[PDB]
Amino acid sequence: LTFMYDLVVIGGGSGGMAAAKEAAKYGKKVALFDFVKPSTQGTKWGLGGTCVNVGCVPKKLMHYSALIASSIHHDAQMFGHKTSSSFEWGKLVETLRNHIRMLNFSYRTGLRVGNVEYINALAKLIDPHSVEYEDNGQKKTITSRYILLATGGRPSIPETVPGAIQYSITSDDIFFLSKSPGKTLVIGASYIGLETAGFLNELGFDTTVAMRSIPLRGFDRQCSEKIVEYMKATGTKFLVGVVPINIEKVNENIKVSFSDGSVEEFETVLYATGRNPDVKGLNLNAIGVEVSDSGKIIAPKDATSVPSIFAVGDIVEGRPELTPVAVKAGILLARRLFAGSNEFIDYDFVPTTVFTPIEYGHVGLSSEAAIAKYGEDDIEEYLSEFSTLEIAAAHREKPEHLRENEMDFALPLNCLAKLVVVKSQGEKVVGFHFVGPNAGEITQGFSLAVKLGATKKDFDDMIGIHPTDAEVFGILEVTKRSGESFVSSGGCGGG
Amino acid sequence: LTFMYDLVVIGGGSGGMAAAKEAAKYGKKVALFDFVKPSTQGTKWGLGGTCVNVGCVPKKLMHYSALIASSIHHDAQMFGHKTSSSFEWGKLVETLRNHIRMLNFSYRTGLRVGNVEYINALAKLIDPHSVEYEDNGQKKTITSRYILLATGGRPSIPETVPGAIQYSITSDDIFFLSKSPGKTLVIGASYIGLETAGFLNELGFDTTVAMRSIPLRGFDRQCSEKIVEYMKATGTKFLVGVVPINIEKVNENIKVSFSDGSVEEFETVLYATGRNPDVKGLNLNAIGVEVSDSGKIIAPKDATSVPSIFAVGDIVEGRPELTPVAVKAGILLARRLFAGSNEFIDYDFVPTTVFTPIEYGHVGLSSEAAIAKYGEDDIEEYLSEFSTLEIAAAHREKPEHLRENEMDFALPLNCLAKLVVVKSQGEKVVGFHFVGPNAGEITQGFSLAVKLGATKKDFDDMIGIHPTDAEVFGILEVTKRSGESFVSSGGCGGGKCG
Ligand SMILES: Cc1cc2nc3c(=O)[nH]c(=O)nc-3n(C[C@H](O)[C@H](O)[C@H](O)COP(=O)(O)OP(=O)(O)OC[C@H]3O[C@@H](n4cnc5c(N)ncnc54)[C@H](O)[C@@H]3O)c2cc1C
């Protein structure tokens, strides 16, 4: 038949490698293109895309290093381990690089063994069935029944702010810096911004976040603000309603001029203001692939305006930019194309965890989205704010430069549990929220239970595992409406 | 006046304090008795019972100290933190003691604020409505509509093994030793024994477990054996099918003579062989409260053979000896008696976690109980063995004394995920099992999902949180039956980046 391939995948990240391997499982001929355009600062990397190289994986290793710093500062001596420690940025980088190298190789092999032809070049569309790449500086064209776009995004730097592109780094550079970043400015109170600032502060760097308005826009306000309260109490500085308007090299430092007329010097400036979909090189306009006002491909069912051309992951408008969503969309697409499946993701139940110094895991609706959808009177919020048992016994203290009196000694309680329930459906759980340690580990299971239609009664009749934080979800009784105190001061942990 | 009290509770542990505070909530007059008989080695403590003083709370703080030791030995340098460290046993004890003291005080207050009359004396039954206690060396009797027994257990030491009672410690003593235990023998591959041996080894002590037969009897074999495999690779020694027959003091050490004719010196010997219900002081025989052959009270629905007398917690036959089971039974009993409730616990869905150096959380049936109940052919086991991402990148190594060659450097993979499903019910999940870090944190949620009737399909269509270990439960595909390798060697953690 008139096609060299059954499936050509442009992009070897979470979406692309998943689609490609699953297609190849059904005896289909599959080619995958992945090439890394260097960052605004010349950083590049191997196969596996944003999550493997410059996202979830390295961020989680840096978070782990941060939790180790925190445990050593706050906890080690109290639990009988008298420790002296010094942090060496280049050692942590070296451990990240070595683990990511192992994963680059692991994914190359996974593709070859999985009968996918991997090509390390930039691909572009020629027509609805044809893709072009260079190979020894010689354009080649290959034909496919089906084409999948999964090119992901890259960090966005404001072109209007002078010096930004030249002098600032992004998430593409932060995990691999040859030198420690020293005094750091992070612009963006997005999850990437807060996570990045959170681990740089925990690791002992002088850290400042420029937050234009509010933290974690779209996320539950109560939880988003508890995180910022905790980050402030552990030494992150926040400029609220302020952004850079100018960025200059003054000798070895970066002089940043702020929108409130203030000035401050930093060693490192990192933009975490968002990401644009990397689609400009794809030749979408000429082929008839429709894009939204944001530049994202219109494909609410993975199918673009061109019926031989599909898209998944961060480049698709109206879906969360998360790795598991990219992967499962790639696998389900592969099955629908080649195994007679008609299964899509249920986008109502996409859980997420933010890996801030205390983590935040949720699925379903914030208090705000719940109140907006069902009305204030059909909503109950059950919640509890408490300390992990082990942390309670550690007596974690504020740095002495942030003390306000003789009874402000303690860090905030590390945990917050909240269920958002609809009264007119026997208190059905429509929102689950947990701030605290291991929040992703806690939320995964609860997210399944919430998807299966768990009620507040189901949560009350649930037997707890003791001692855990997650057992708190079985004895929540204080409501926001009641106006009574949701703090628990006694240290039984999750209760 | 018919009865002085609505409810009298004998025992101020998890069951008793929960029943008592909940009864008092409904305007009922409530008395609670708690007194601590000293351990075989003279150790005593305040209000709150086994979990607060000599169980879950101190065990979990010692485990945390162990995780800290492990993180500093294995991980700190790799994650950029060059450290020097030394362990001080008495400092950890002091941090435990301070936190437990705060909890003793917190519970005294919680009872007074909650309108419960707390009495620090031993109580016994006089008849179906009467209990006796001493007070300034003067016997007093008080009358109640209802009496609740929640006296818990105490560690059991074999009377048959000479020197055992005199020279050995139990879980009652281990958290408060004034001196570090040094070289330690633990008898029992029960959860208490393994957890105890696990943290003493992690904390740098020369540790040995005398295991009569198998680890964690009643628990899933595959998971129980992964734990012992991991504990062995990190320095715990296991004597299999061997137990002490004699225990003697040679100077300041304890010479232990074993059933296989072998002999060895230890600084500390700890019996974790199990626990007997503390009911001998209660005068049960004379009142007509029926007990099993094990001495546990027969009360399958909390009601004893005497209908005014109830029981909850560790003393009741045929229920798990866990704190949340004690608490919820206490609360539900209080509600049935005084708030017109008719709710009992569903004993089919009681999750538990063992806090071994890698933890083990589960709910429902082992592979063994699943195969026995439904038959081998109506059972699928889906599983994956892998490493946490962070642990994978740390390259955790065996201690040099257990190395056999140049390729046995690595610790076992830290994680094992397993679902046990029934084919004839569209692969309904009847058993959930997770070995690895934060296993209780992972299991709590899944336990609820499994109770609500989650299928293998539900698990496969579940969106992952990345990077976690718990996302592995969304992509399990290898079956035991398939005989294929369930190991993954690459370090994407629980999930796949693609
Ligand atoms: C700092 C950070 C932290 C994150 N943390 C998490 C987290 O904790 N959990 C989570 O679930 N998600 C997380 N994410 C999100 C996650 O990284 C993405 O959602 C996911 O990687 C999306 O994958 P994708 O398949 O859309 O494409 P990507 O993984 O981004 O890969 C697309 C690939 O295409 C390549 N490419 C682009 N154009 C072409 C071309 N024309 N030809 C060939 N190759 C091309 C790119 O170089 C890239 O390799 C994080 C993201 C970032 C930036």
Ligand SMILES: Cc1cc2nc3c(=O)[nH]c(=O)nc-3n(C[C@H](O)[C@H](O)[C@H](O)COP(=O)(O)OP(=O)(O)OC[C@H]3O[C@@H](n4cnc5c(N)ncnc54)[C@H](O)[C@@H]3O)c2cc1C
């Ligand atoms: C080492 C260890 C670790 C454990 N770890 C865990 C764990 O991690 N998770 C978990 O869920 N469970 C754990 N447990 C189990 C948990 O401690 C018990 O299941 C629970 O505490 C039992 O509660 P209870 O109400 O039956 O009795 P207890 O909590 O034992 O309290 C009974 C109280 O009554 C007192 N008493 C006895 N006789 C009388 C009398 N005549 N008059 C007055 N007072 C009396 C006792 O001294 C005690 O104070 C552990 C147990 C041990 C020993």
